[PDB]
Amino acid sequence: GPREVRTIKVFTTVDNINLHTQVVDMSMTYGQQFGPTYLDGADVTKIKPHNSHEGKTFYVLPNDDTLRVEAFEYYHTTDPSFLGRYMSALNHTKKWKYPQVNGLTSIKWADNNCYLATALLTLQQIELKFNPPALQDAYYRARAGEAANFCALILAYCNKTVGELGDVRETMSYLFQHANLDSCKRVLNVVCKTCGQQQTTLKGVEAVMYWGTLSYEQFKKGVQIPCTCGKQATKYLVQQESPFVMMSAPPAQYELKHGTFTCASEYTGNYQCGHYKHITSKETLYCIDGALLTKSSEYKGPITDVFYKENSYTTTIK
Ligand SMILES: [Zn+2]
């Protein structure tokens, strides 16, 4: 008989839904045949096919027309490096633990993931619909307790790697861009005794996010901002249409009072070397810190984001 190649049968994919049958040469690396290749997040680019690999599914980079279409439609990304960064993160997040704390999926602390835990807890408490099929799929999986893919996707979408220190407000900003916030609208009015008044309408992400004040009530009453003429002007909320709002500000000692907010991010410590915790208002106040939970009737600490429920609001200010 003539000398012949040994092969096995595997599937490749970019979305784990459309599987593509491949015959691989056992004498070559996966990289030699597919380019960068991943097995449940593990980089097997330099590995030759094992007999145990037969029938398994491998993730590859979108390097042909079919895979580019499938990656673009599933992930809503134009970045060729997306699949690689996602799988590199999944290799770690699949090893994290995701305890249920107070009825929510949290993350046990690892790899400086405190900002991810507080973001994950927050996402389970505000009404959000993600546009990428990958995010909406992984999110439901996260609510059921299996958050590893959702966490690796958040890292990919935010261009962060495992172990990098993160920021909740920036994370929320990246994710909100992938959310359907089309019916979200905010109308603001800015009043200066000299220059008069000017109204502004904001839609989408800019209608739900605000930087500089934690108190939604204070935003309704009016916040002092500098105006172009050197006098402090007053900016106040005229109309809001959204299922929630997110008020953020530099970490500052702040009292959280039960029933007046949905949840909040505490940041202790110094700039870019501190620690996030999550505070949620249920029947009392719950402080979720990864796997850890404490309860209290009152809470005061260095708060940096507060989330509030909303539906429709219209000022009574003339
Ligand atoms: Zn002015």
PDB file of C-alpha atoms and ligand atoms in Angstrom:
ATOM      1  CA  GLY A   1       0.000   0.000   0.000  1.00  0.00           C
ATOM      2  CA  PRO A   2       1.053   3.595  -0.683  1.00  0.00           C
ATOM      3  CA  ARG A   3       2.143   5.918   2.107  1.00  0.00           C
ATOM      4  CA  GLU A   4      -0.813   8.037   3.247  1.00  0.00           C
ATOM      5  CA  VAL A   5      -1.719  10.881   5.609  1.00  0.00           C
ATOM      6  CA  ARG A   6      -3.441  10.189   8.915  1.00  0.00           C
ATOM      7  CA  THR A   7      -6.471  12.398   9.423  1.00  0.00           C
ATOM      8  CA  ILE A   8      -9.281  13.005  11.877  1.00  0.00           C
ATOM      9  CA  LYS A   9     -12.580  14.827  11.594  1.00  0.00           C
ATOM     10  CA  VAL A  10     -13.207  18.023  13.590  1.00  0.00           C
ATOM     11  CA  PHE A  11     -15.525  21.002  13.437  1.00  0.00           C
ATOM     12  CA  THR A  12     -14.415  24.611  13.230  1.00  0.00           C
ATOM     13  CA  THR A  13     -16.550  27.601  14.127  1.00  0.00           C
ATOM     14  CA  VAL A  14     -16.591  31.241  15.051  1.00  0.00           C
ATOM     15  CA  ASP A  15     -20.053  31.398  16.683  1.00  0.00           C
ATOM     16  CA  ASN A  16     -20.415  27.817  18.051  1.00  0.00           C
ATOM     17  CA  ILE A  17     -23.698  27.587  16.118  1.00  0.00           C
ATOM     18  CA  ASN A  18     -22.575  27.125  12.498  1.00  0.00           C
ATOM     19  CA  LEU A  19     -20.150  24.179  12.660  1.00  0.00           C
ATOM     20  CA  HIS A  20     -17.837  23.452   9.714  1.00  0.00           C
ATOM     21  CA  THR A  21     -16.586  19.906   9.134  1.00  0.00           C
ATOM     22  CA  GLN A  22     -12.818  19.676   8.552  1.00  0.00           C
ATOM     23  CA  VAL A  23     -10.391  16.834   7.859  1.00  0.00           C
ATOM     24  CA  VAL A  24      -7.101  17.643   9.611  1.00  0.00           C
ATOM     25  CA  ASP A  25      -3.659  16.189   8.936  1.00  0.00           C
ATOM     26  CA  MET A  26      -2.285  14.695  12.150  1.00  0.00           C
ATOM     27  CA  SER A  27       1.275  15.526  11.025  1.00  0.00           C
ATOM     28  CA  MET A  28       0.705  19.313  11.009  1.00  0.00           C
ATOM     29  CA  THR A  29      -0.155  21.800  13.743  1.00  0.00           C
ATOM     30  CA  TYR A  30      -3.643  23.276  13.867  1.00  0.00           C
ATOM     31  CA  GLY A  31      -1.992  26.626  13.173  1.00  0.00           C
ATOM     32  CA  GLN A  32      -0.532  25.199   9.964  1.00  0.00           C
ATOM     33  CA  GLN A  33      -4.006  24.187   8.824  1.00  0.00           C
ATOM     34  CA  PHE A  34      -6.365  26.776  10.324  1.00  0.00           C
ATOM     35  CA  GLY A  35      -4.297  29.678  11.566  1.00  0.00           C
ATOM     36  CA  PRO A  36      -4.843  30.444  15.264  1.00  0.00           C
ATOM     37  CA  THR A  37      -7.051  27.729  16.734  1.00  0.00           C
ATOM     38  CA  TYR A  38      -8.670  27.340  20.160  1.00  0.00           C
ATOM     39  CA  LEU A  39     -10.217  24.437  22.081  1.00  0.00           C
ATOM     40  CA  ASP A  40     -12.651  25.713  24.723  1.00  0.00           C
ATOM     41  CA  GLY A  41     -10.464  28.822  25.012  1.00  0.00           C
ATOM     42  CA  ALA A  42      -7.090  27.022  25.063  1.00  0.00           C
ATOM     43  CA  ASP A  43      -4.610  28.093  22.370  1.00  0.00           C
ATOM     44  CA  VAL A  44      -3.884  24.896  20.417  1.00  0.00           C
ATOM     45  CA  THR A  45      -2.270  26.675  17.473  1.00  0.00           C
ATOM     46  CA  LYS A  46       1.084  24.902  18.079  1.00  0.00           C
ATOM     47  CA  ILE A  47      -0.537  21.529  18.891  1.00  0.00           C
ATOM     48  CA  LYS A  48      -0.827  18.563  16.483  1.00  0.00           C
ATOM     49  CA  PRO A  49      -4.246  16.842  16.424  1.00  0.00           C
ATOM     50  CA  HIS A  50      -4.701  14.197  19.110  1.00  0.00           C
ATOM     51  CA  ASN A  51      -6.925  11.197  18.517  1.00  0.00           C
ATOM     52  CA  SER A  52      -9.144  12.473  21.353  1.00  0.00           C
ATOM     53  CA  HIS A  53      -9.820  15.623  19.294  1.00  0.00           C
ATOM     54  CA  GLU A  54     -12.010  13.743  16.818  1.00  0.00           C
ATOM     55  CA  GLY A  55     -15.497  15.226  16.603  1.00  0.00           C
ATOM     56  CA  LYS A  56     -14.636  18.169  18.840  1.00  0.00           C
ATOM     57  CA  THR A  57     -15.428  21.803  17.965  1.00  0.00           C
ATOM     58  CA  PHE A  58     -12.595  24.324  17.556  1.00  0.00           C
ATOM     59  CA  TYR A  59     -12.754  28.117  17.375  1.00  0.00           C
ATOM     60  CA  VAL A  60     -10.712  29.719  14.566  1.00  0.00           C
ATOM     61  CA  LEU A  61     -10.155  33.272  13.342  1.00  0.00           C
ATOM     62  CA  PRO A  62     -12.602  34.478  10.678  1.00  0.00           C
ATOM     63  CA  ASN A  63     -10.241  34.061   7.714  1.00  0.00           C
ATOM     64  CA  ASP A  64     -12.682  33.253   4.877  1.00  0.00           C
ATOM     65  CA  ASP A  65     -15.866  34.869   3.554  1.00  0.00           C
ATOM     66  CA  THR A  66     -18.206  32.469   5.361  1.00  0.00           C
ATOM     67  CA  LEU A  67     -16.514  32.885   8.746  1.00  0.00           C
ATOM     68  CA  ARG A  68     -16.305  36.666   8.322  1.00  0.00           C
ATOM     69  CA  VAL A  69     -20.061  36.788   7.768  1.00  0.00           C
ATOM     70  CA  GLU A  70     -20.732  34.533  10.757  1.00  0.00           C
ATOM     71  CA  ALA A  71     -18.401  36.488  13.072  1.00  0.00           C
ATOM     72  CA  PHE A  72     -19.783  39.860  11.977  1.00  0.00           C
ATOM     73  CA  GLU A  73     -23.405  38.760  12.432  1.00  0.00           C
ATOM     74  CA  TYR A  74     -22.901  37.001  15.794  1.00  0.00           C
ATOM     75  CA  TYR A  75     -20.524  39.437  17.527  1.00  0.00           C
ATOM     76  CA  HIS A  76     -21.204  42.796  15.775  1.00  0.00           C
ATOM     77  CA  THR A  77     -17.483  43.469  15.442  1.00  0.00           C
ATOM     78  CA  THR A  78     -15.218  44.626  12.614  1.00  0.00           C
ATOM     79  CA  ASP A  79     -12.017  43.914  14.566  1.00  0.00           C
ATOM     80  CA  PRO A  80     -10.138  40.860  13.157  1.00  0.00           C
ATOM     81  CA  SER A  81      -8.566  40.255  16.566  1.00  0.00           C
ATOM     82  CA  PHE A  82     -11.914  39.910  18.366  1.00  0.00           C
ATOM     83  CA  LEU A  83     -12.160  36.088  18.330  1.00  0.00           C
ATOM     84  CA  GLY A  84      -8.608  35.720  19.608  1.00  0.00           C
ATOM     85  CA  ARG A  85      -9.101  38.174  22.485  1.00  0.00           C
ATOM     86  CA  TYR A  86     -12.413  36.526  23.389  1.00  0.00           C
ATOM     87  CA  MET A  87     -10.896  33.046  23.518  1.00  0.00           C
ATOM     88  CA  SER A  88      -7.847  34.261  25.450  1.00  0.00           C
ATOM     89  CA  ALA A  89     -10.207  35.708  28.074  1.00  0.00           C
ATOM     90  CA  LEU A  90     -12.472  32.627  28.118  1.00  0.00           C
ATOM     91  CA  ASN A  91      -9.491  30.439  28.969  1.00  0.00           C
ATOM     92  CA  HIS A  92      -9.380  32.337  32.302  1.00  0.00           C
ATOM     93  CA  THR A  93     -13.033  33.192  32.974  1.00  0.00           C
ATOM     94  CA  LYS A  94     -14.023  29.541  32.513  1.00  0.00           C
ATOM     95  CA  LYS A  95     -11.945  28.879  35.659  1.00  0.00           C
ATOM     96  CA  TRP A  96     -13.582  31.628  37.748  1.00  0.00           C
ATOM     97  CA  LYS A  97     -16.402  30.760  40.145  1.00  0.00           C
ATOM     98  CA  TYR A  98     -19.843  32.361  39.807  1.00  0.00           C
ATOM     99  CA  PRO A  99     -21.693  32.005  43.147  1.00  0.00           C
ATOM    100  CA  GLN A 100     -25.310  33.063  43.541  1.00  0.00           C
ATOM    101  CA  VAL A 101     -25.411  35.950  46.010  1.00  0.00           C
ATOM    102  CA  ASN A 102     -28.769  37.415  47.046  1.00  0.00           C
ATOM    103  CA  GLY A 103     -30.444  35.831  44.019  1.00  0.00           C
ATOM    104  CA  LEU A 104     -27.905  37.280  41.539  1.00  0.00           C
ATOM    105  CA  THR A 105     -24.943  35.805  39.688  1.00  0.00           C
ATOM    106  CA  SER A 106     -21.701  37.244  41.116  1.00  0.00           C
ATOM    107  CA  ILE A 107     -18.022  36.385  40.569  1.00  0.00           C
ATOM    108  CA  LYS A 108     -15.601  35.156  43.193  1.00  0.00           C
ATOM    109  CA  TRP A 109     -12.623  37.539  43.248  1.00  0.00           C
ATOM    110  CA  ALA A 110      -9.765  36.678  40.860  1.00  0.00           C
ATOM    111  CA  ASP A 111      -7.499  38.502  38.418  1.00  0.00           C
ATOM    112  CA  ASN A 112      -8.661  41.952  39.621  1.00  0.00           C
ATOM    113  CA  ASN A 113     -12.184  41.150  38.385  1.00  0.00           C
ATOM    114  CA  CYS A 114     -14.038  43.241  41.011  1.00  0.00           C
ATOM    115  CA  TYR A 115     -15.202  45.777  38.402  1.00  0.00           C
ATOM    116  CA  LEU A 116     -16.613  42.901  36.318  1.00  0.00           C
ATOM    117  CA  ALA A 117     -18.495  41.439  39.268  1.00  0.00           C
ATOM    118  CA  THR A 118     -20.124  44.755  40.069  1.00  0.00           C
ATOM    119  CA  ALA A 119     -20.950  45.312  36.383  1.00  0.00           C
ATOM    120  CA  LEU A 120     -22.403  41.801  36.127  1.00  0.00           C
ATOM    121  CA  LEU A 121     -24.547  42.328  39.229  1.00  0.00           C
ATOM    122  CA  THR A 122     -25.696  45.667  37.841  1.00  0.00           C
ATOM    123  CA  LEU A 123     -26.699  44.228  34.464  1.00  0.00           C
ATOM    124  CA  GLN A 124     -29.036  41.759  36.166  1.00  0.00           C
ATOM    125  CA  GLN A 125     -30.989  44.591  37.778  1.00  0.00           C
ATOM    126  CA  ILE A 126     -31.604  47.086  34.946  1.00  0.00           C
ATOM    127  CA  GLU A 127     -33.662  46.487  31.822  1.00  0.00           C
ATOM    128  CA  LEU A 128     -31.333  46.035  28.863  1.00  0.00           C
ATOM    129  CA  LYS A 129     -31.570  44.282  25.485  1.00  0.00           C
ATOM    130  CA  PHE A 130     -28.269  43.562  23.730  1.00  0.00           C
ATOM    131  CA  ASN A 131     -28.071  43.766  19.958  1.00  0.00           C
ATOM    132  CA  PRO A 132     -25.225  41.230  19.231  1.00  0.00           C
ATOM    133  CA  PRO A 133     -26.648  37.697  19.328  1.00  0.00           C
ATOM    134  CA  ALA A 134     -23.468  36.655  21.159  1.00  0.00           C
ATOM    135  CA  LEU A 135     -24.037  39.116  24.018  1.00  0.00           C
ATOM    136  CA  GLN A 136     -27.761  38.443  24.372  1.00  0.00           C
ATOM    137  CA  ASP A 137     -27.097  34.677  24.319  1.00  0.00           C
ATOM    138  CA  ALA A 138     -24.306  34.765  26.893  1.00  0.00           C
ATOM    139  CA  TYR A 139     -26.281  37.162  29.102  1.00  0.00           C
ATOM    140  CA  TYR A 140     -29.188  34.727  29.528  1.00  0.00           C
ATOM    141  CA  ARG A 141     -26.591  32.046  30.207  1.00  0.00           C
ATOM    142  CA  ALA A 142     -25.067  34.362  32.817  1.00  0.00           C
ATOM    143  CA  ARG A 143     -28.405  34.885  34.596  1.00  0.00           C
ATOM    144  CA  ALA A 144     -28.722  31.096  34.871  1.00  0.00           C
ATOM    145  CA  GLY A 145     -25.365  31.026  36.678  1.00  0.00           C
ATOM    146  CA  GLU A 146     -22.992  30.229  33.790  1.00  0.00           C
ATOM    147  CA  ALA A 147     -21.377  33.633  33.272  1.00  0.00           C
ATOM    148  CA  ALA A 148     -17.963  32.604  31.890  1.00  0.00           C
ATOM    149  CA  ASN A 149     -18.733  33.411  28.236  1.00  0.00           C
ATOM    150  CA  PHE A 150     -20.540  36.636  29.141  1.00  0.00           C
ATOM    151  CA  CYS A 151     -17.532  37.769  31.178  1.00  0.00           C
ATOM    152  CA  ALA A 152     -15.054  36.894  28.417  1.00  0.00           C
ATOM    153  CA  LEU A 153     -17.226  38.783  25.914  1.00  0.00           C
ATOM    154  CA  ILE A 154     -17.331  41.880  28.140  1.00  0.00           C
ATOM    155  CA  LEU A 155     -13.534  41.828  28.235  1.00  0.00           C
ATOM    156  CA  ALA A 156     -13.357  41.423  24.450  1.00  0.00           C
ATOM    157  CA  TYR A 157     -15.898  44.180  23.784  1.00  0.00           C
ATOM    158  CA  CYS A 158     -14.118  46.514  26.216  1.00  0.00           C
ATOM    159  CA  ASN A 159     -10.665  45.721  24.798  1.00  0.00           C
ATOM    160  CA  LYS A 160      -9.530  44.585  28.261  1.00  0.00           C
ATOM    161  CA  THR A 161      -7.504  41.524  29.190  1.00  0.00           C
ATOM    162  CA  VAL A 162      -7.867  39.293  32.242  1.00  0.00           C
ATOM    163  CA  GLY A 163      -6.018  40.827  35.201  1.00  0.00           C
ATOM    164  CA  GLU A 164      -6.128  44.378  33.879  1.00  0.00           C
ATOM    165  CA  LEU A 165      -7.723  46.782  36.348  1.00  0.00           C
ATOM    166  CA  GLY A 166     -11.063  47.986  35.024  1.00  0.00           C
ATOM    167  CA  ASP A 167     -13.525  50.827  35.473  1.00  0.00           C
ATOM    168  CA  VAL A 168     -17.274  50.208  35.867  1.00  0.00           C
ATOM    169  CA  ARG A 169     -18.362  53.418  34.119  1.00  0.00           C
ATOM    170  CA  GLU A 170     -16.161  52.696  31.097  1.00  0.00           C
ATOM    171  CA  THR A 171     -17.356  49.092  31.006  1.00  0.00           C
ATOM    172  CA  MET A 172     -20.994  50.176  31.131  1.00  0.00           C
ATOM    173  CA  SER A 173     -20.310  52.713  28.387  1.00  0.00           C
ATOM    174  CA  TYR A 174     -18.889  50.037  26.048  1.00  0.00           C
ATOM    175  CA  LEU A 175     -21.762  47.604  26.750  1.00  0.00           C
ATOM    176  CA  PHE A 176     -24.482  50.270  26.417  1.00  0.00           C
ATOM    177  CA  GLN A 177     -23.220  50.976  22.879  1.00  0.00           C
ATOM    178  CA  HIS A 178     -24.206  47.370  22.096  1.00  0.00           C
ATOM    179  CA  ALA A 179     -27.631  47.754  23.685  1.00  0.00           C
ATOM    180  CA  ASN A 180     -30.860  48.842  22.045  1.00  0.00           C
ATOM    181  CA  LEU A 181     -31.305  52.256  23.656  1.00  0.00           C
ATOM    182  CA  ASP A 182     -33.165  53.698  20.695  1.00  0.00           C
ATOM    183  CA  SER A 183     -36.254  54.872  22.577  1.00  0.00           C
ATOM    184  CA  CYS A 184     -34.071  56.488  25.275  1.00  0.00           C
ATOM    185  CA  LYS A 185     -34.311  60.258  25.317  1.00  0.00           C
ATOM    186  CA  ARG A 186     -33.146  62.976  27.694  1.00  0.00           C
ATOM    187  CA  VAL A 187     -33.965  66.684  27.477  1.00  0.00           C
ATOM    188  CA  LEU A 188     -31.851  69.112  29.486  1.00  0.00           C
ATOM    189  CA  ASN A 189     -32.059  72.845  30.003  1.00  0.00           C
ATOM    190  CA  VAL A 190     -29.090  75.028  30.924  1.00  0.00           C
ATOM    191  CA  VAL A 191     -29.859  78.417  32.474  1.00  0.00           C
ATOM    192  CA  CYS A 192     -27.431  81.326  32.925  1.00  0.00           C
ATOM    193  CA  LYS A 193     -28.571  84.705  34.257  1.00  0.00           C
ATOM    194  CA  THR A 194     -26.510  86.414  31.520  1.00  0.00           C
ATOM    195  CA  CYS A 195     -26.624  84.133  28.465  1.00  0.00           C
ATOM    196  CA  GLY A 196     -30.204  82.934  28.894  1.00  0.00           C
ATOM    197  CA  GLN A 197     -31.269  79.333  28.416  1.00  0.00           C
ATOM    198  CA  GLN A 198     -30.566  76.521  25.995  1.00  0.00           C
ATOM    199  CA  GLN A 199     -32.254  73.155  25.754  1.00  0.00           C
ATOM    200  CA  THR A 200     -30.450  70.013  24.588  1.00  0.00           C
ATOM    201  CA  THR A 201     -31.819  66.607  23.561  1.00  0.00           C
ATOM    202  CA  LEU A 202     -29.722  63.468  24.042  1.00  0.00           C
ATOM    203  CA  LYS A 203     -30.504  59.987  22.728  1.00  0.00           C
ATOM    204  CA  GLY A 204     -29.085  56.528  23.187  1.00  0.00           C
ATOM    205  CA  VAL A 205     -26.151  56.123  25.557  1.00  0.00           C
ATOM    206  CA  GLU A 206     -25.869  59.854  26.211  1.00  0.00           C
ATOM    207  CA  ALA A 207     -29.478  59.807  27.409  1.00  0.00           C
ATOM    208  CA  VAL A 208     -28.838  57.309  30.239  1.00  0.00           C
ATOM    209  CA  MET A 209     -25.310  58.175  31.425  1.00  0.00           C
ATOM    210  CA  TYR A 210     -24.273  61.315  33.344  1.00  0.00           C
ATOM    211  CA  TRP A 211     -20.867  62.313  34.782  1.00  0.00           C
ATOM    212  CA  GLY A 212     -20.431  64.642  37.773  1.00  0.00           C
ATOM    213  CA  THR A 213     -23.343  64.012  40.152  1.00  0.00           C
ATOM    214  CA  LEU A 214     -24.508  60.854  41.918  1.00  0.00           C
ATOM    215  CA  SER A 215     -27.937  62.147  42.967  1.00  0.00           C
ATOM    216  CA  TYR A 216     -30.737  61.784  40.411  1.00  0.00           C
ATOM    217  CA  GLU A 217     -32.871  64.126  42.536  1.00  0.00           C
ATOM    218  CA  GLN A 218     -30.131  66.767  42.418  1.00  0.00           C
ATOM    219  CA  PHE A 219     -30.101  66.373  38.609  1.00  0.00           C
ATOM    220  CA  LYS A 220     -33.833  67.103  38.640  1.00  0.00           C
ATOM    221  CA  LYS A 221     -33.389  70.157  40.892  1.00  0.00           C
ATOM    222  CA  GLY A 222     -30.423  71.491  38.925  1.00  0.00           C
ATOM    223  CA  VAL A 223     -26.650  71.103  39.111  1.00  0.00           C
ATOM    224  CA  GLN A 224     -24.174  73.975  39.086  1.00  0.00           C
ATOM    225  CA  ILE A 225     -21.924  73.744  36.036  1.00  0.00           C
ATOM    226  CA  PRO A 226     -19.499  76.356  34.694  1.00  0.00           C
ATOM    227  CA  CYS A 227     -20.926  78.366  31.818  1.00  0.00           C
ATOM    228  CA  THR A 228     -18.967  79.896  28.943  1.00  0.00           C
ATOM    229  CA  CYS A 229     -19.123  83.324  30.649  1.00  0.00           C
ATOM    230  CA  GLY A 230     -17.348  82.352  33.885  1.00  0.00           C
ATOM    231  CA  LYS A 231     -20.527  82.290  35.957  1.00  0.00           C
ATOM    232  CA  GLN A 232     -21.895  79.011  37.295  1.00  0.00           C
ATOM    233  CA  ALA A 233     -24.952  78.124  35.174  1.00  0.00           C
ATOM    234  CA  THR A 234     -27.689  75.678  36.187  1.00  0.00           C
ATOM    235  CA  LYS A 235     -28.397  72.505  34.202  1.00  0.00           C
ATOM    236  CA  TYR A 236     -31.494  70.513  35.105  1.00  0.00           C
ATOM    237  CA  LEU A 237     -33.387  67.529  33.758  1.00  0.00           C
ATOM    238  CA  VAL A 238     -36.434  68.577  31.709  1.00  0.00           C
ATOM    239  CA  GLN A 239     -37.631  65.210  30.443  1.00  0.00           C
ATOM    240  CA  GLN A 240     -36.371  61.648  30.684  1.00  0.00           C
ATOM    241  CA  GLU A 241     -37.618  58.558  28.850  1.00  0.00           C
ATOM    242  CA  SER A 242     -35.660  55.414  29.674  1.00  0.00           C
ATOM    243  CA  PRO A 243     -35.987  52.272  31.789  1.00  0.00           C
ATOM    244  CA  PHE A 244     -33.065  53.391  33.947  1.00  0.00           C
ATOM    245  CA  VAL A 245     -30.461  56.098  34.425  1.00  0.00           C
ATOM    246  CA  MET A 246     -26.834  55.816  35.535  1.00  0.00           C
ATOM    247  CA  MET A 247     -25.351  58.677  37.584  1.00  0.00           C
ATOM    248  CA  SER A 248     -21.555  58.619  37.976  1.00  0.00           C
ATOM    249  CA  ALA A 249     -18.991  60.867  39.645  1.00  0.00           C
ATOM    250  CA  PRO A 250     -15.444  60.635  41.092  1.00  0.00           C
ATOM    251  CA  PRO A 251     -15.489  58.448  44.224  1.00  0.00           C
ATOM    252  CA  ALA A 252     -16.806  60.532  47.096  1.00  0.00           C
ATOM    253  CA  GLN A 253     -18.297  59.754  50.499  1.00  0.00           C
ATOM    254  CA  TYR A 254     -22.012  59.361  49.843  1.00  0.00           C
ATOM    255  CA  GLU A 255     -25.037  58.136  51.816  1.00  0.00           C
ATOM    256  CA  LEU A 256     -27.221  55.504  50.127  1.00  0.00           C
ATOM    257  CA  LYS A 257     -30.760  55.335  51.516  1.00  0.00           C
ATOM    258  CA  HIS A 258     -32.925  52.247  51.130  1.00  0.00           C
ATOM    259  CA  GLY A 259     -35.631  52.470  48.482  1.00  0.00           C
ATOM    260  CA  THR A 260     -34.210  55.563  46.723  1.00  0.00           C
ATOM    261  CA  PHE A 261     -32.007  53.776  44.166  1.00  0.00           C
ATOM    262  CA  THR A 262     -31.627  50.382  42.528  1.00  0.00           C
ATOM    263  CA  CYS A 263     -27.908  49.656  42.926  1.00  0.00           C
ATOM    264  CA  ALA A 264     -24.546  51.397  43.147  1.00  0.00           C
ATOM    265  CA  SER A 265     -20.787  50.888  42.773  1.00  0.00           C
ATOM    266  CA  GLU A 266     -18.492  51.698  45.689  1.00  0.00           C
ATOM    267  CA  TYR A 267     -14.812  52.312  44.937  1.00  0.00           C
ATOM    268  CA  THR A 268     -12.435  52.275  47.921  1.00  0.00           C
ATOM    269  CA  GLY A 269      -8.757  53.059  47.700  1.00  0.00           C
ATOM    270  CA  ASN A 270      -6.654  55.214  45.448  1.00  0.00           C
ATOM    271  CA  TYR A 271      -6.944  56.026  41.755  1.00  0.00           C
ATOM    272  CA  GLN A 272      -6.616  52.896  39.603  1.00  0.00           C
ATOM    273  CA  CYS A 273      -5.461  50.736  42.524  1.00  0.00           C
ATOM    274  CA  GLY A 274      -8.593  50.336  44.627  1.00  0.00           C
ATOM    275  CA  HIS A 275     -11.472  47.905  44.964  1.00  0.00           C
ATOM    276  CA  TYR A 276     -15.062  47.874  43.697  1.00  0.00           C
ATOM    277  CA  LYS A 277     -18.048  46.669  45.694  1.00  0.00           C
ATOM    278  CA  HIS A 278     -21.718  46.460  44.723  1.00  0.00           C
ATOM    279  CA  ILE A 279     -24.604  47.833  46.815  1.00  0.00           C
ATOM    280  CA  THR A 280     -28.179  46.845  45.974  1.00  0.00           C
ATOM    281  CA  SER A 281     -31.430  48.043  47.587  1.00  0.00           C
ATOM    282  CA  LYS A 282     -33.859  45.212  48.258  1.00  0.00           C
ATOM    283  CA  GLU A 283     -35.816  44.868  51.508  1.00  0.00           C
ATOM    284  CA  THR A 284     -32.653  46.210  53.154  1.00  0.00           C
ATOM    285  CA  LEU A 285     -29.239  47.262  51.793  1.00  0.00           C
ATOM    286  CA  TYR A 286     -26.967  44.484  50.537  1.00  0.00           C
ATOM    287  CA  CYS A 287     -23.232  44.920  49.935  1.00  0.00           C
ATOM    288  CA  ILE A 288     -22.039  42.241  47.491  1.00  0.00           C
ATOM    289  CA  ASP A 289     -18.242  42.020  47.221  1.00  0.00           C
ATOM    290  CA  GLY A 290     -17.587  39.136  44.863  1.00  0.00           C
ATOM    291  CA  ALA A 291     -18.615  36.027  46.778  1.00  0.00           C
ATOM    292  CA  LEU A 292     -19.050  38.030  49.987  1.00  0.00           C
ATOM    293  CA  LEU A 293     -22.242  39.546  51.342  1.00  0.00           C
ATOM    294  CA  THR A 294     -23.043  41.930  54.193  1.00  0.00           C
ATOM    295  CA  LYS A 295     -26.367  43.568  54.973  1.00  0.00           C
ATOM    296  CA  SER A 296     -27.172  46.857  56.697  1.00  0.00           C
ATOM    297  CA  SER A 297     -30.037  49.282  57.105  1.00  0.00           C
ATOM    298  CA  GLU A 298     -27.871  52.218  56.032  1.00  0.00           C
ATOM    299  CA  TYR A 299     -24.826  52.612  53.819  1.00  0.00           C
ATOM    300  CA  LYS A 300     -22.220  55.336  53.470  1.00  0.00           C
ATOM    301  CA  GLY A 301     -18.973  54.960  51.544  1.00  0.00           C
ATOM    302  CA  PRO A 302     -16.978  56.191  48.534  1.00  0.00           C
ATOM    303  CA  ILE A 303     -19.651  55.839  45.812  1.00  0.00           C
ATOM    304  CA  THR A 304     -18.882  56.309  42.119  1.00  0.00           C
ATOM    305  CA  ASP A 305     -21.967  55.064  40.167  1.00  0.00           C
ATOM    306  CA  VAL A 306     -25.635  54.951  41.159  1.00  0.00           C
ATOM    307  CA  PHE A 307     -28.354  53.320  39.047  1.00  0.00           C
ATOM    308  CA  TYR A 308     -31.994  54.410  39.235  1.00  0.00           C
ATOM    309  CA  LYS A 309     -35.157  52.959  37.761  1.00  0.00           C
ATOM    310  CA  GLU A 310     -37.047  55.162  35.357  1.00  0.00           C
ATOM    311  CA  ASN A 311     -39.847  55.123  32.840  1.00  0.00           C
ATOM    312  CA  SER A 312     -41.062  58.639  32.081  1.00  0.00           C
ATOM    313  CA  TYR A 313     -40.186  61.880  33.880  1.00  0.00           C
ATOM    314  CA  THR A 314     -41.205  65.469  33.145  1.00  0.00           C
ATOM    315  CA  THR A 315     -40.074  68.452  35.190  1.00  0.00           C
ATOM    316  CA  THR A 316     -42.471  70.813  36.936  1.00  0.00           C
ATOM    317  CA  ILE A 317     -39.834  73.581  36.713  1.00  0.00           C
ATOM    318  CA  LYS A 318     -41.089  76.496  34.608  1.00  0.00           C
TER     319      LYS A 318
HETATM  320 ZN    ZN B   1     -23.362  82.670  30.951  1.00  0.00          ZN
END
